[PDB]
Ligand binder design. Structure first.
Ligand SMILES: CC(=O)N[C@@H]1[C@@H](O)[C@H](O[C@@H]2O[C@H](CO[C@H]3O[C@H](CO)[C@@H](O)[C@H](O)[C@@H]3O[C@@H]3O[C@H](CO)[C@@H](O[C@@H]4O[C@H](CO)[C@H](O)[C@H](O)[C@H]4O)[C@H](O)[C@H]3NC(C)=O)[C@@H](O)[C@H](O[C@H]3O[C@H](CO)[C@@H](O)[C@H](O)[C@@H]3O[C@@H]3O[C@H](CO)[C@@H](O[C@@H]4O[C@H](CO)[C@H](O)[C@H](O)[C@H]4O)[C@H](O)[C@H]3NC(C)=O)[C@@H]2O)[C@@H](CO)O[C@H]1O
Ligand SMILES: [Ca+2]
Ligand SMILES: [Ca+2]
Ligand SMILES: [Mn+2]
Ligand SMILES: [Mn+2]
Lengths: 181, 47, 180, 52
């Protein structure tokens, strides 16, 4: 057994246990990943590496995470690109911005990526997003083209609470977004 | 009121290294928006 | 609120959430800080910083840690120097070895060290240790001369379990060592 | 089963920075011993709202 847990309820000016990348900073009790400025990237990572599976044993971890985020856009139509909760190699640095959401660099599976990310995607990139053109939740394994997606209506400026859980016995990864209105 | 859910079988062990770092990313392109996180909780356990 | 927790029941060979310093490393599920070898120092630090107090609210944190450890001397006489659990600045580096337990450099109070340590001292150093010569548990703030001591009889090669708890409301630090 | 307990009032915010790292050390010198740890558990909690 190995367990890692932490909770930050109000982020504060010198939040030393987070690694900030790109334009991530903490400000006014929030973790601000991007400002409403065009073409930036911001990322933030928990400081400790976590052990997700063991080679000796074949054992994979069970985990759960929840967080509440706010996407604040200029208006409901000019919103982009999105947000992601990702799991990546320990030395992960920002990847391609724009519609690649700073985690990936391609629409085709790339085993080198080693990144699993749940995305809250607000912009339709015709080359890889679902043909309905909707805003959406998705699970990305090693490519920005999601292996599954659910359509989502963005409520601009509202807080959304998200729970993501992984059950190692069944390998099911589950994500729930709830707008408290 | 409004909730959304997604479930997929993603054998994590087949894609990611034994030790990983977790976190958040957000980008803007030609269009933009502020993406901010208000709180975060995480717990994992490996038998 | 801010919380930080972890548990490691068995240390693997690649224990990436710990920072190793001096001779520390993991071998056969144990974390080895020193080997039964002369003059070394080993430290292992948990990788995240811990928000222990806040200058904006003035609030301090409550915490518990527990660990099982073993000292394994050549025999019950020739044993030195001891082991430490410490809280230090995020950039902490090994300090002087020997009787300073790789964590202090002076017998005299140094406010710039900014370390408090709970030690389990198995060697008597005339210059700052309990004159009774006993092995002992001590609470050290910024010097190797503890502000408080308790005698303790070392059972060589035996697993000791310790609990260290800090109560922010009373500012009391409690240490318990029990041999099964 | 034999135990030793020690208590001391030590006002931490006087002695440590706001952000710290915790860990173990062990040294040997002229005299020596192997020093190992077999397991470790930790939990901290800061109100930064109340006090506890
Ligand atoms: C069909 C066509 O070819 N049109 C060309 C475009 O190719 C050309 O550039 C691109 O524009 C894309 C969008 O084009 C829009 O306009 C055309 C016509 O005017 C429309 O046909 C088209 O459909 C687009 O409408 C925009 O569409 C989106 C959806 O696609 C709308 O959002 C929503 O859409 C849904 C469904 O349609 C629904 O309707 C919603 O209500 C609606 O709001 C949007 O409203 C509408 N308006 C605009 C202004 O487009 C861009 O997507 C494309 O890519 C960049 O931006 C997106 C979004 O942020 C990123 O996801 C994408 O990855 C990329 O990000 C980065 O953008 C910056 C800035 O452009 C790039 O940086 C520049 O790059 C240069 C080289 O490329 C240099 O390096 C330069 O230094 C650097 O600053 C950066 O490279 C991008 N990064 C990456 C990884 O891609 C791209 O800009 C446009 C230009 O005017 O002209 C069209 O005619
Ligand atoms: Ca997109
Ligand atoms: Ca000594
Ligand atoms: Mn997508
Ligand atoms: Mn002493």
């Amino acid at each position: 057994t190995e367990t890692t847990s932490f909770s930050i309820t109000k982020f504060g000016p010198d939040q030393q246990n987070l690694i900030f990348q790109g334009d991530g900073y903490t400000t006014k009790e929030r973790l601000t990943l991007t400002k409403a400025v065009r073409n930036t990237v911001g990322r933030a990572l928990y400081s400790s590496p976590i052990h997700i599976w063991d080679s000796k044993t074949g054992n994979v971890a069970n985990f759960v995470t929840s967080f509440t985020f706010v996407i604040d856009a200029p208006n409901s139509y000019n919103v982009a690109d999105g947000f992601t909760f990702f799991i990546a190699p320990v030395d992960t640095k920002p990847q391609t911005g724009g519609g690649y959401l700073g985690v990936f660099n391609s629409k085709d599976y790339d085993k080198t990526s080693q990144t699993v990310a749940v995305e809250f995607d607000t912009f339709y990139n015709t080359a890889w997003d679902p043909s309905n053109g909707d805003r959406h939740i998705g699970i990305d394994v090693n490519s920005i083209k999601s292996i599954n997606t659910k359509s989502w209506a963005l409520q601009n400026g509202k807080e959304a609470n998200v729970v993501i859980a992984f059950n190692a016995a069944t390998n099911v990864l589950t994500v729930s977004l709830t707008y408290p209105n | 009121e409004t909730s959304y859910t997604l479930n997929e079988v993603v054998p994590l062990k087949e894609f990611v290294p034994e030790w990983v770092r977790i976190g958040f990313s957000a980008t803007t392109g030609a269009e933009f928006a502020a993406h901010e996180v208000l709180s975060w909780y995480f717990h994992s356990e490996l038998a």
